[model samples]
Target chain A: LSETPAACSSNPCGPEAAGTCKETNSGYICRCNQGYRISLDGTGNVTCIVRQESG
Target chain B: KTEIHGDSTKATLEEGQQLTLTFISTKLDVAVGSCHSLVANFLDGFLKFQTGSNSAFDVVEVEEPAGPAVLTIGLGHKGRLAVVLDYTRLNAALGSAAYVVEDSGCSSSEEVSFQGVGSGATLVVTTLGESPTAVS
Candidate 1:
């Protein structure tokens, strides 16, 4: 079987300023910036957005 | 996994997350004699507390590195994460020697607690989001 490629190898999380990318079982996830949080948009893509404080 | 490492204790936290710590003194006679409070210093976050009436108190907003800190965990563009627990009252009650138990969770808000001067505590690194690779 061909070796599975690394999801984070492409820097899929974006620039280093965006967040730290951690590879998961099937894909990658981003641990965003200080004021941001990892979010999945309506288009089924992962991105970072400013976190709104919740009560 | 937001877990501690080494004898000194270290961990990582993300935005919308906070670590809950309980300082237990090895000395046998610890008590709740008087009301006490603690201050939490976050490098790029807000420190908040609550009163009996559900009123909230915003302690401090650490938008940048101010003074000396124990140690800071490296975050991204936000800068290194630093939160120091000032537990002067507790130090006076119990000696400087104590064991700290760290509890962590995710929340949109944060709170504070007390800590001693020399007692081993946690060095927290704040990230932007939760760890999807963490073992549930």
Candidate 2:
């Protein structure tokens, strides 16, 4: 079967941006680049932002 | 005079910093060559450092190493003295309301040597204690 749309994009950002694959086992889980964070929607979409204090 | 006592507090340190032992409570009864749990509070967060057994009280310096972003400590005496860096304790301490860092478990040989047994002990950590800084 053709590959389903992974939660994350092979290269979501511009060409200079690093790409990552979604996490397996948990189809909902997607990997984020070093300086990115997964959106709250759980769709595996990531956003670039400065690191904040993690609660 | 403001007298502060019996209040649990936390302090943050940077990498390659030094923290002198002002008071090692006799209540803890830390024995040489044995393991005693310790908590290190940092700016980013807390971490843990488990001390190895030693006959006498000692001061330890937390140093950073290359690769994997690990912190290491230089234990006085021969390489015989040492302890590993424990990240689990940190996670647990942080999980709770406590903001103290945790070190790895304490492990050392029974024999007593002036110098470390091997290349010397290097404990890993992310930060170290800082000297008092006065803000302008």
Best lDDT among the predictions, by candidate number: 1
- DockQ for each numbered candidate: 0.02, 0.01
Top DockQ model: 1
lDDT of 2 by residue, A1-55 (tens): 3433332343322123222322222121222233322121111122222212110
- TM-score against truth, every candidate: 0.24, 0.19
lDDT of 2 by residue, B84-113 (tens): 221112222211111111221323222211
Error of 2 at B58 (Å): 43
Q: What is the interface RMSD of each candidate, in Å?
A: 15.4, 20.3
**What Cα-based lDDT does every candidate model obtain?**
0.27, 0.22
Model 2 chain A scores worst on lDDT over the 10 consecutive residues at A38-47
Return the TM-scores of chain A for each candidate in numbered order: 0.51, 0.31
Runs in model 2 deviating more than 4 A are A1-5, A9-19, A42-48, A53-55, B1-136
